[PDB]
Structure formats: C-alpha cells, structure tokens
C-alpha cells in the first residue's frame, strides 16, 4: 500500500537525524526506532520503520535529492576536488575562429585560426 | 464571442475560396476551412508483406505507395477523430507531431 505524509515525513526525519545508527535490515532498523523515538501503536511503528528501510536502501545509493547527511557531503567534497585538467594550460596557441580574433585586435596574444 | 483568431479557416486576403466536397459526408466545405490529411501508406498492408515476398516474380520488388488526400469537413473530422479534442489554450497549437 501507499504510505502517507504522516509516515513519509516522519521516516524522512528518522533517516535524516539518525542515519549512522541505521542499517539495511528491517528488524534492527525497527529496534533503533523504539529506542530513539516514542511511537504509540505497534503497527504504526512498522509503517515508519518499513519506509525507513525503503529510504535507507536508496540513500545508501544516495539517490534522494532532499535529505542531507553529515557524512555524505564530506565524502562528496573529496569527489568535488578533482585533480584539475583545466584547459588553460592545455590550450597553447589558441585557435580562435576568423572573426573572433578581430574583436581582440587591441590587445592580443596566442593567435591561431 | 470570436472563438478563433482565423475564424476556423485559413482565408486571409481573399474574398472567396472554392468549395470542396467532404470525403466522408459529401458536405460543401471551403478548401481553406477543410481538414486535410495527406496519407501516404503502402498498397499492400504491412501484415501481408512477408506473403508478397514469397509470391513476387521479381527479385527486390518494391511495394508501391498509396497516395490519397483525405479532405474532411469540420463535423466529420471530429467524428473521424482526424482532429483531436484540445483545451482552449491547446487550440492555438499548429504543429503536427
């Protein structure tokens, strides 16, 4: 069945606040949920903890664009710092097409068609 | 009110466009107002094309095309669904897919 915003916004908060304490197995993922929240009825725990596992599977792939986890940007900034092959050194004697050089005739360098 | 900016037909800078007969209703519609769908399909349908390969005298026979200009009046063109039901803002589309 389809979960609602009372479950999905809840389970979004659980994976967002408490991501490292979670795991892909559901029964461990429910065992954190009584320890760390207060949810009254045992069916509605299973509604939430089920969708937490359905979130934690795709956040393990990192697919969701909304939620944001402290580990997942510090790993991202390592990926952000590419060893830079910027073409400012790679381009030598820049080939600029015939009319593009004429606009730079006042102050010019690296002239090629 | 005025429903369409061109008043349904493509007539601009004319006084008169000669009527044509509907291909389905035989109504008298002007050539400008008439819905025209030029269909170019093969003479033999695509289901039977394997059966004409076995039966041709000719190696590499090309099945000929069938050329017909369906010209529909407005009443039958919505009934034959040659023109699709669109919204009011969807009416101003002109491009074919």
């Amino acid at each position: 069945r389809v979960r609602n915003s009372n479950v999905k916004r809840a389970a979004k908060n659980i994976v967002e606040k408490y991501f490292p304490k979670l795991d892909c197995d559901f029964h461990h993922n429910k065992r954190v949920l009584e320890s760390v929240t207060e949810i009254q009825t045992k069916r509605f725990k299973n509604q939430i903890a089920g969708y937490v596992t359905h979130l934690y599977t795709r956040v393990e792939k990192g697919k969701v664009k909304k939620i944001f986890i402290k580990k997942h940007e510090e790993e991202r900034e390592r990926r952000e710092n590419m060893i830079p092959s910027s073409s400012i050194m790679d381009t030598e004697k820049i080939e600029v097409d015939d009319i593009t050089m004429q606009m730079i005739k006042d102050y010019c360098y690296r002239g090629n068609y | 009110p005025v429903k369409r900016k061109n008043h349904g037909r493509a007539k601009k800078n004319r006084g008169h466009v000669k009527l044509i007969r509907c291909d389905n209703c035989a109504s008298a519609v002007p050539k400008d107002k008439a819905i025209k769908r030029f269909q170019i399909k093969s003479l033999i349908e695509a289901a039977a094309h394997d059966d004409v390969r076995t039966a041709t005298i000719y190696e590499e026979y090309e099945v000929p095309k069938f050329f017909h200009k369906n010209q529909y009046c407005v009443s039958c063109a919505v009934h034959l669904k040659a023109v699709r039901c669109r919204s009011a803002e969807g009416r101003k589309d002109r491009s074919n897919p």
């Binding site: 009372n6 809840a10 908060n13 659980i14 606040k17 408490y18 760390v36 929240t37 207060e38 949810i39 009254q40 009825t41 509605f44 939430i48 | -």
Partner: protein, 51 residues
C-alpha cells in the same frame, strides 16, 4: 475521538419552537488528566535529538 472530543447537547424551548445546540470541543493533550487525555493521539510521534 472518545478521549479527545467531549460533546454536549442542550435543547431550548422558545416562543417559536425548539432549538438544539450541540457543542463539541477538542481537548488539549496534557500528561496530567485535569485538562485532557494522558495518552497522545496515535498519529502524533516524538523524535529525540542527536547531539
């Protein structure tokens, strides 16, 4: 519903006829039951804080 809304009915007899006035009031949650029910509504949840 049986905890949180308490509803009332009183009837009025006037010159014109009978008027019935229903008052249904939602109660605020309070852990001490002097103001409302002790158990929360089942859809509401509490999340603790990580720090």
């Amino acid at each position: 519903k049986e905890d949180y809304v308490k509803e009332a009915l009183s009837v009025v007899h006037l010159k014109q006829g009978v008027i019935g006035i229903k008052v249904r009031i939602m109660l605020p949650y309070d852990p001490e039951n002097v103001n409302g029910p002790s158990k929360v509504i089942s859809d509401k949840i509490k999340i603790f804080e990580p720090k």
